[PDB]
Every structure is written in C-alpha cells, then in structure tokens.
C-alpha cells in the first residue's frame, strides 16, 4: 500500500518517488520501480474495531494459572490451554486467550463469579479457543464453551485436538462456517455442544455448515462435559472422545 512520497535517489526529483508497504518505490519522473523496507514497517496499522477492549496483559493483571477446583480442571490444563485468573478491582476474572498461529493473543474472553462475559482484542468470526494448539491430526473435539474444552483436555492429559467456539452456541453455524477451512485437516469433528434445547439447536446448525461426513454428536448424561466431569461421568466423555 502507498505510505507517502519520498525523494528519488535515482532521477533526482524531490517528491516524485512514492513509498509503499512493500518497501518498494516508484518514480513518476524517471519511471523506476524498485522493491526503506524499514521505514515502511514503522507505518503498518494494527489494532482493531474502535470501542473494543484492549487485550489484558497477564503480567499486569495479577494473573496466575490456578486450577479450577470447582470445575475439575487443574493448573496444568489451564496453563496449556491458555486459561488464567486475573485479580482486578480486588475482583476475580477468568481469561481465555484466543491466540493465532504464531501464539499471539488476538482476543480474550473474560468472565467473573456472577458469570459475566467481556471481550477484548479482535474476537473475530473464526474465534476458536485452543485453535493455535493443533496442526491438524486424526480427530478434533469441538466443545461449546472454553471450560468444556478444558474438561476434555483434563481427561486426555492435553494430548489431543480440542477447541471451543468463540461466541457460544448461537454463532455455532458462523464460527464453524468461518472455520470450515481449518476443521478440514482432521478426519473427524466431534461436535460436543451443550446437552439442552438451545445446545441441541446449535448442533443442528453447526453440523450443516461443517464438512459433510466428518461430524459426530456427543450425548452426555449431564448438562455439559463439565457437568458430567463433576458427576463421575468421565466414562461417557471418554467414550465419545475417541
Ligand atoms: Mg450453553
Ligand atoms: Mg458449564
Ligand atoms: Zn527518479
């Protein structure tokens, strides 16, 4: 992209040479096009949708990777999925770091005791908690919420593909749709969404936009994976996870 004019080191004009992102320039005068690469960087936009919250920094939020005892998830799991705790305004928050291919936090999903959702960074359509952890494979389990994603991980010793959905059950169709490209590196996709009216509707939807023939639907004797996990039903979670 065009950054701004620059004097030409060739023909010797003054402002007839334009500088782009590339790092390349073009001189209208002499008509030369060479591919400053530094200057160009120092001008790359970034940031996200105005109004949205800034990604919370672990080292500046009192963040610690504690274990969710009342959920059955350990620190070790939390630490691998990128799920941490923050103490702000004396209050407590749980943070789900949605990272990109290069482990760069892109967005975060923050919730508190009363269970109030808050977003940060650029929580795009393809938001998939855990996504950055698996380069394809045999199977991939897709829970509904980060904590369900977390549960399957506990039970599997964090050794196999599990991701969550960015904007809950509703976006189910769009998130999976938005992630069709991704989800197709695995031979299977275990849609393990909530075990209720709303959740069951989401599965209906997701299944639709997802790659035909690879889907699969989990059936838990509880509300959701963690619900089971807090009721010895790990058996049925494992039973449907392989
Ligand atoms: Mg739900
Ligand atoms: Mg739950
Ligand atoms: Zn020139």
| Residues 182/159, Cβ–Cβ less than 8 Å | no
Distance CA 126, CA 146 (A): 15
Q: Which of 172, 171, 151, 178 is nearest to 162 (CA)?
A: 151
In DSSP terms, 85 is beta-bridged to 64, 94
Query: What is the distance in A from the centroid of ligand 3 to the CA of 33?
Result: 9
CATH 2.20.25.10 placement within the chain:
1-43
Per the listing, tokens 């977003």 go with 119
* 194 among annotated binding-site residues: yes
Query: What is the distance in A from the centroid of ligand 1 to the CA of 145?
Result: 7
* 27 among annotated binding-site residues: yes
* 224 among annotated binding-site residues: yes
Q: Minimum-distance ligand to the CA of 115?
A: 2
Query: What is the distance in A from the centroid of ligand 3 to the CA of 7?
Result: 8
Total H helices, total E strands in the chain = 8, 12
Ranges of beta strands (E only) in the chain are 2-6, 17-20, 25-27, 33-34, 83-88, 91-99, 105-111, 118-121, 141-143, 162-163, 189-192, 215-217
Strands 83-88 and 91-99, by their bridges, are antiparallel
Structure solved via: X-ray
Residue range 1-43 forms a domain whose CATH class is mainly beta
Q: Which two tokens stand for residue 121?
A: 């960074």
Strands 141-143 and 162-163, by their bridges, are parallel
Strands 215-217 and 162-163, by their bridges, are unpaired
Residues with Cβ within 8 Å of 97's Cβ and at least 6 positions away in sequence, in order, are 82, 83, 84, 105, 108
Q: Minimum-distance ligand to the CA of 71?
A: 2
Q: Which of 118, 113, 163 is nearest to 140 (CA)?
A: 163
Q: Minimum-distance ligand to the CA of 224?
A: 2
- Kindly list the distances between the CA atom of residue 187 and the CA atoms of 113, 167, 172, in Å, as whole numbers in the listed order: 38, 24, 20
Query: What is the distance in A from the centroid of ligand 2 to the CA of 227?
Result: 6
- Kindly list the distances between the CA atom of residue 24 and the CA atoms of 9, 29, 32, 39, 207, in Å, as whole numbers in the listed order: 13, 16, 10, 11, 46
| Residues 168/145, Cβ–Cβ less than 8 Å | yes
């Amino acid at each position: 992209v065009f950054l701004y004019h620059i004097p030409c080191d060739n023909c010797g004009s003054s402002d007839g040479n334009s500088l782009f992102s590339d790092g390349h320039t073009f001189c209208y005068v002499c008509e030369k096009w060479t591919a400053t690469k530094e200057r160009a960087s120092k001008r790359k936009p970034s940031g996200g949708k105005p109004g949205t919250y800034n990604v919370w920094n672990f080292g500046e939020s009192n963040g610690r990777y504690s274990a969710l005892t009342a959920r059955g998830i350990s620190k070790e799991t939390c630490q691998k999925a990128g799920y941490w705790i923050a103490k702000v305004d004396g209050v407590m928050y749980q943070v789900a770091d949605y990272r990109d291919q290069n482990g760069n936090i892109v967005s975060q999903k923050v919730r508190d005791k009363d269970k109030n959702f808050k977003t940060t960074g650029s929580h795009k359509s393809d938001a998939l908690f855990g996504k950055h952890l698996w380069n394809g494979g045999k199977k991939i389990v897709v829970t509904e919420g980060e904590i369900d994603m977390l549960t399957v991980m506990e039970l599997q010793d964090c050794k196999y593909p599990v991701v969550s959905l960015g904007h809950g059950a509703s976006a189910a169709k769009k998130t999976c749709a938005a992630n069709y490209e991704y989800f197709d590196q695995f031979e299977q996709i275990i849609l393990m969404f909530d075990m209720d009216e709303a959740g069951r509707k989401a599965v209906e939807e997701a299944a639709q936009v997802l790659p035909a023939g690879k889907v699969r639907v989990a059936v838990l004797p509880c509300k959701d994976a963690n619900e089971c996990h807090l009721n010895g039903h790990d058996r049925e979670i494992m039973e449907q996870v392989w």
